[PDB]
């Protein structure tokens, strides 16, 4: 039988709370403040605005300044076009952490996408289900200040700088939504291939633009070291093709062993369409 899946945008209430400086208990207190905020959030709520600490803003600022040096030569065209929009409209500054609420309202206007806070990792099914309603489950906390440039888990710096500028792009938002739509009620096996295709496009994808390799994966756009690595000569690069890409292991603790190149967002979407027919 078909497993449960959300039928309307507020149905994400019943799956977004199904969550699946590490010896710093002060940081842990701060982290669970953020966790409770997301757990208590219900669809329709304004996303709670947070007063980030001076330490957190400094971390964001250290991440922001270094990444902005790399984006002109590394990030895809669409990313470069929307990032200034977010600076004008959502307060993307070195000295200010944008609020999820403001970014959510900006995205609703540009592509209909919206943000919902999440405490931690959901199942691939639950996480991809939000995309079907143009809802991106986003973390709200800031990484630990001892290491601004590496984080084991994604934080709001990764969401705001990695994911958000592409969610503002209609062609990308369509692609993302169709990943989630295909996932709704699909088999566990089918969810796992869709999540892997998501991983190697939304999170770690490359694209070719005017003969040049550029990055659009959010996990690259928020990682100073892997961003440079991906466009270096050290990187194994293969064409995006869902039937092989879905067989690739998604690495979490290291650099990816391979990065997949899409011809364009429209082309990755068409390839996804053919692939979901067969699954
Ligand atoms: C499709 C896989 N997947 C999943 O199965 N359940 C999730 O909940 C999830 C997720 N993928 C993300 C987004 C994500 C994960 N990573 C990055 N972005 C960039 C750095 C590498 C790891 N999430 C939600 C966030 C996890 C904290 C909430
Ligand atoms: Fe991500």
Short mmCIF file of C-alpha atoms and ligand atoms in Angstrom, two decimals:
data_model
loop_
_atom_site.label_atom_id
_atom_site.label_comp_id
_atom_site.label_asym_id
_atom_site.label_seq_id
_atom_site.Cartn_x
_atom_site.Cartn_y
_atom_site.Cartn_z
CA UNK A 1 0.00 0.00 0.00
CA UNK A 2 0.95 3.67 -0.32
CA UNK A 3 2.59 5.12 2.82
CA UNK A 4 1.23 8.33 4.28
CA UNK A 5 2.24 11.55 2.55
CA UNK A 6 1.21 15.18 3.09
CA UNK A 7 -1.73 16.33 0.97
CA UNK A 8 -1.56 20.05 1.72
CA UNK A 9 1.10 22.42 2.96
CA UNK A 10 -0.08 22.33 6.60
CA UNK A 11 0.25 18.53 6.56
CA UNK A 12 4.00 19.10 6.96
CA UNK A 13 3.18 19.74 10.65
CA UNK A 14 2.88 15.97 11.14
CA UNK A 15 6.28 15.10 9.66
CA UNK A 16 8.59 18.07 10.31
CA UNK A 17 8.82 17.22 14.04
CA UNK A 18 9.85 13.60 13.30
CA UNK A 19 13.51 14.40 13.88
CA UNK A 20 15.89 11.44 13.78
CA UNK A 21 31.32 22.29 20.18
CA UNK A 22 29.96 18.90 21.00
CA UNK A 23 31.17 18.94 24.62
CA UNK A 24 30.20 22.62 24.94
CA UNK A 25 27.03 22.56 27.06
CA UNK A 26 26.53 26.30 26.63
CA UNK A 27 26.40 25.73 22.88
CA UNK A 28 24.14 22.73 23.52
CA UNK A 29 21.77 24.97 25.51
CA UNK A 30 21.69 27.39 22.57
CA UNK A 31 21.16 24.56 20.11
CA UNK A 32 18.15 23.17 21.91
CA UNK A 33 16.62 26.64 22.14
CA UNK A 34 16.67 26.49 18.35
CA UNK A 35 15.38 22.90 18.37
CA UNK A 36 12.40 23.83 20.56
CA UNK A 37 11.62 26.77 18.27
CA UNK A 38 11.39 24.43 15.28
CA UNK A 39 9.51 21.73 17.22
CA UNK A 40 6.92 24.29 18.36
CA UNK A 41 6.55 25.79 14.88
CA UNK A 42 3.28 25.09 13.03
CA UNK A 43 2.39 26.01 9.46
CA UNK A 44 0.98 29.51 9.21
CA UNK A 45 3.19 30.81 11.99
CA UNK A 46 5.61 33.64 11.38
CA UNK A 47 9.00 31.96 11.67
CA UNK A 48 10.29 33.14 15.09
CA UNK A 49 12.92 35.83 14.72
CA UNK A 50 16.04 35.13 16.77
CA UNK A 51 18.49 37.58 18.31
CA UNK A 52 21.78 36.00 17.33
CA UNK A 53 24.69 36.48 19.72
CA UNK A 54 27.71 38.59 18.86
CA UNK A 55 29.67 35.34 18.63
CA UNK A 56 27.20 33.86 16.14
CA UNK A 57 27.17 36.99 13.97
CA UNK A 58 30.99 36.93 13.86
CA UNK A 59 30.93 33.32 12.70
CA UNK A 60 28.41 34.14 9.97
CA UNK A 61 30.53 37.14 9.01
CA UNK A 62 33.68 35.03 8.80
CA UNK A 63 31.87 32.50 6.59
CA UNK A 64 30.16 35.20 4.50
CA UNK A 65 33.25 37.26 3.65
CA UNK A 66 35.40 34.30 2.61
CA UNK A 67 32.70 32.70 0.47
CA UNK A 68 31.88 35.96 -1.31
CA UNK A 69 35.48 36.07 -2.55
CA UNK A 70 34.94 32.73 -4.31
CA UNK A 71 31.38 33.03 -5.68
CA UNK A 72 32.24 35.24 -8.74
CA UNK A 73 34.59 32.56 -10.10
CA UNK A 74 32.82 29.46 -8.73
CA UNK A 75 29.04 29.90 -8.44
CA UNK A 76 26.64 29.43 -11.34
CA UNK A 77 25.05 32.44 -13.04
CA UNK A 78 21.69 32.06 -11.31
CA UNK A 79 23.31 32.10 -7.87
CA UNK A 80 25.26 35.27 -8.71
CA UNK A 81 22.08 36.99 -9.94
CA UNK A 82 19.97 36.37 -6.82
CA UNK A 83 22.58 36.93 -4.10
CA UNK A 84 22.46 40.75 -4.54
CA UNK A 85 18.66 40.57 -4.37
CA UNK A 86 18.94 38.92 -0.96
CA UNK A 87 21.42 41.56 0.17
CA UNK A 88 18.98 44.32 -0.79
CA UNK A 89 15.86 42.63 0.57
CA UNK A 90 16.81 40.17 3.33
CA UNK A 91 19.77 41.94 4.94
CA UNK A 92 22.57 39.66 3.75
CA UNK A 93 25.51 41.52 5.31
CA UNK A 94 28.80 40.59 6.92
CA UNK A 95 27.46 41.99 10.21
CA UNK A 96 23.89 40.66 10.16
CA UNK A 97 22.43 37.15 10.04
CA UNK A 98 19.29 37.25 7.85
CA UNK A 99 16.10 36.01 9.48
CA UNK A 100 14.37 32.91 8.13
CA UNK A 101 11.02 34.78 8.16
CA UNK A 102 12.31 37.54 5.87
CA UNK A 103 13.95 35.04 3.53
CA UNK A 104 10.77 32.96 3.49
CA UNK A 105 8.66 35.97 2.51
CA UNK A 106 11.16 36.95 -0.16
CA UNK A 107 11.10 33.44 -1.66
CA UNK A 108 7.29 33.25 -1.54
CA UNK A 109 7.26 36.36 -3.72
CA UNK A 110 9.92 35.17 -6.19
CA UNK A 111 9.07 31.48 -6.68
CA UNK A 112 6.42 30.57 -4.10
CA UNK A 113 8.98 28.69 -2.01
CA UNK A 114 8.79 29.06 1.77
CA UNK A 115 10.87 28.05 4.78
CA UNK A 116 9.95 25.87 7.73
CA UNK A 117 12.38 25.51 10.69
CA UNK A 118 13.57 21.99 11.49
CA UNK A 119 15.30 20.68 14.61
CA UNK A 120 17.45 18.12 12.82
CA UNK A 121 17.55 15.40 10.19
CA UNK A 122 14.18 14.11 9.01
CA UNK A 123 13.67 10.98 6.97
CA UNK A 124 14.38 11.42 3.23
CA UNK A 125 10.65 10.87 2.65
CA UNK A 126 9.61 13.60 5.08
CA UNK A 127 12.34 16.01 3.95
CA UNK A 128 11.57 15.57 0.24
CA UNK A 129 7.82 15.80 0.92
CA UNK A 130 8.22 19.45 1.94
CA UNK A 131 9.67 20.26 -1.48
CA UNK A 132 6.38 19.12 -3.07
CA UNK A 133 4.74 22.17 -1.47
CA UNK A 134 7.73 24.43 -2.21
CA UNK A 135 8.71 24.21 1.47
CA UNK A 136 12.38 23.96 2.36
CA UNK A 137 13.06 22.58 5.84
CA UNK A 138 15.79 24.89 7.12
CA UNK A 139 18.05 24.89 10.17
CA UNK A 140 18.06 28.09 12.24
CA UNK A 141 21.13 27.66 14.49
CA UNK A 142 24.66 28.85 13.77
CA UNK A 143 27.63 26.45 13.70
CA UNK A 144 30.08 26.43 16.60
CA UNK A 145 32.36 29.46 16.73
CA UNK A 146 35.53 27.38 17.25
CA UNK A 147 35.38 26.28 13.59
CA UNK A 148 33.61 28.70 11.23
CA UNK A 149 34.74 26.89 8.09
CA UNK A 150 33.84 23.25 8.76
CA UNK A 151 30.64 21.88 10.24
CA UNK A 152 29.69 18.18 10.56
CA UNK A 153 26.00 19.07 10.15
CA UNK A 154 24.39 21.90 8.14
CA UNK A 155 23.54 25.14 9.93
CA UNK A 156 21.69 28.27 8.93
CA UNK A 157 24.82 29.64 7.24
CA UNK A 158 24.56 26.67 4.87
CA UNK A 159 20.86 27.24 4.29
CA UNK A 160 21.04 30.99 3.74
CA UNK A 161 24.20 31.02 1.62
CA UNK A 162 23.94 27.61 -0.03
CA UNK A 163 20.26 26.92 -0.69
CA UNK A 164 18.37 30.22 -0.61
CA UNK A 165 19.80 32.05 -3.67
CA UNK A 166 18.82 29.15 -5.94
CA UNK A 167 15.38 28.66 -4.38
CA UNK A 168 14.76 32.20 -5.64
CA UNK A 169 15.36 31.04 -9.24
CA UNK A 170 12.16 29.81 -10.99
CA UNK A 171 13.91 27.10 -13.02
CA UNK A 172 15.64 25.70 -9.92
CA UNK A 173 12.51 25.90 -7.74
CA UNK A 174 10.59 23.91 -10.37
CA UNK A 175 13.34 21.25 -10.40
CA UNK A 176 13.37 21.00 -6.60
CA UNK A 177 9.56 20.80 -6.34
CA UNK A 178 9.42 18.00 -8.90
CA UNK A 179 11.86 15.96 -6.82
CA UNK A 180 9.49 16.24 -3.86
CA UNK A 181 6.34 15.69 -5.94
CA UNK A 182 7.82 12.48 -7.35
CA UNK A 183 8.62 11.34 -3.81
CA UNK A 184 5.07 11.65 -2.45
CA UNK A 185 3.86 8.15 -1.61
CA UNK A 186 6.63 6.54 -3.67
CA UNK A 187 8.35 3.31 -2.68
CA UNK A 188 11.11 3.36 -0.08
CA UNK A 189 13.52 2.35 -2.85
CA UNK A 190 12.25 5.18 -5.06
CA UNK A 191 12.58 7.72 -2.22
CA UNK A 192 16.19 6.66 -1.74
CA UNK A 193 17.09 7.26 -5.40
CA UNK A 194 15.28 10.60 -5.42
CA UNK A 195 17.15 11.66 -2.28
CA UNK A 196 20.45 10.60 -3.89
CA UNK A 197 19.65 12.57 -7.05
CA UNK A 198 18.73 15.51 -4.81
CA UNK A 199 22.05 15.09 -2.99
CA UNK A 200 24.09 15.23 -6.21
CA UNK A 201 22.22 18.22 -7.68
CA UNK A 202 20.69 20.47 -4.98
CA UNK A 203 23.48 19.79 -2.46
CA UNK A 204 26.57 18.97 -4.54
CA UNK A 205 25.73 19.65 -8.19
CA UNK A 206 27.88 21.29 -10.83
CA UNK A 207 26.63 22.79 -14.07
CA UNK A 208 28.28 23.81 -17.33
CA UNK A 209 27.65 27.42 -18.36
CA UNK A 210 29.39 28.94 -21.39
CA UNK A 211 31.80 26.00 -21.53
CA UNK A 212 32.75 26.54 -17.88
CA UNK A 213 32.14 24.28 -14.88
CA UNK A 214 30.20 26.15 -12.20
CA UNK A 215 28.75 25.07 -8.86
CA UNK A 216 25.14 25.10 -7.74
CA UNK A 217 25.13 22.47 -4.97
CA UNK A 218 24.30 24.16 -1.66
CA UNK A 219 26.82 22.11 0.32
CA UNK A 220 29.57 23.40 -1.95
CA UNK A 221 28.40 27.02 -1.88
CA UNK A 222 28.60 27.01 1.95
CA UNK A 223 31.92 25.12 2.24
CA UNK A 224 35.07 27.12 1.54
CA UNK A 225 37.30 24.08 1.10
CA UNK A 226 35.08 21.80 -0.97
CA UNK A 227 33.91 24.70 -3.17
CA UNK A 228 37.51 25.25 -4.28
CA UNK A 229 38.10 21.50 -4.44
CA UNK A 230 35.14 20.90 -6.76
CA UNK A 231 36.33 23.33 -9.46
CA UNK A 232 40.01 22.36 -9.05
CA UNK A 233 41.65 19.51 -10.95
CA UNK A 234 41.51 17.12 -8.02
CA UNK A 235 37.83 16.38 -8.57
CA UNK A 236 36.30 13.38 -10.31
CA UNK A 237 33.50 14.80 -12.49
CA UNK A 238 30.78 12.81 -14.30
CA UNK A 239 27.68 13.78 -16.30
CA UNK A 240 24.48 13.94 -14.29
CA UNK A 241 22.34 10.96 -15.26
CA UNK A 242 19.85 9.78 -12.64
CA UNK A 243 20.12 6.03 -13.31
CA UNK A 244 23.83 6.11 -12.42
CA UNK A 245 23.80 9.10 -10.04
CA UNK A 246 21.19 7.40 -7.84
CA UNK A 247 23.60 4.49 -7.30
CA UNK A 248 26.29 6.82 -5.89
CA UNK A 249 27.00 6.82 -2.16
CA UNK A 250 26.32 10.19 -0.51
CA UNK A 251 29.36 10.99 1.62
CA UNK A 252 28.86 13.16 4.70
CA UNK A 253 32.10 13.27 6.68
CA UNK A 254 34.51 13.84 3.76
CA UNK A 255 34.67 15.49 0.37
CA UNK A 256 32.52 13.82 -2.26
CA UNK A 257 34.31 11.17 -4.33
CA UNK A 258 32.56 12.52 -7.45
CA UNK A 259 30.57 15.56 -8.57
CA UNK A 260 27.89 15.34 -11.23
CA UNK A 261 27.50 18.03 -13.91
CA UNK A 262 24.07 19.02 -15.20
CA UNK A 263 23.76 20.81 -18.54
CA UNK A 264 21.24 23.25 -17.02
CA UNK A 265 18.49 23.22 -14.43
CA UNK A 266 15.94 22.66 -17.20
CA UNK A 267 17.93 19.67 -18.48
CA UNK A 268 18.39 18.07 -15.05
CA UNK A 269 14.63 18.44 -14.62
CA UNK A 270 13.87 16.73 -17.95
CA UNK A 271 16.27 13.90 -17.05
CA UNK A 272 14.55 13.60 -13.65
CA UNK A 273 11.17 13.41 -15.41
CA UNK A 274 12.26 10.48 -17.60
CA UNK A 275 13.85 8.79 -14.58
CA UNK A 276 10.75 9.00 -12.38
CA UNK A 277 8.67 7.39 -15.15
CA UNK A 278 10.80 4.25 -14.84
CA UNK A 279 10.64 4.25 -11.01
C1 LIG B 1 18.06 14.03 1.32
C2 LIG B 1 18.98 13.90 2.54
N1 LIG B 1 18.30 14.43 3.74
C3 LIG B 1 17.50 13.62 4.45
O1 LIG B 1 17.35 12.45 4.12
N2 LIG B 1 16.85 14.13 5.57
C4 LIG B 1 17.06 15.47 5.91
O2 LIG B 1 16.48 15.89 6.91
C5 LIG B 1 17.87 16.24 5.17
C6 LIG B 1 18.47 15.71 4.09
N3 LIG B 1 19.21 16.65 3.52
C7 LIG B 1 19.07 17.75 4.23
C8 LIG B 1 19.78 19.07 3.87
C9 LIG B 1 21.32 18.90 3.88
C10 LIG B 1 22.00 17.86 4.34
N4 LIG B 1 23.30 18.13 4.14
C11 LIG B 1 23.40 19.34 3.57
N5 LIG B 1 22.16 19.81 3.41
C12 LIG B 1 24.65 19.89 3.24
C13 LIG B 1 25.82 19.24 3.97
C14 LIG B 1 25.72 17.75 3.77
C15 LIG B 1 24.47 17.28 4.50
N6 LIG B 1 18.25 17.53 5.27
C16 LIG B 1 17.78 18.50 6.34
C17 LIG B 1 18.89 19.11 7.23
C18 LIG B 1 19.76 18.06 7.89
C19 LIG B 1 19.82 19.07 9.05
C20 LIG B 1 18.37 19.35 8.65
FE1 LIG B 2 21.59 21.49 2.38
#
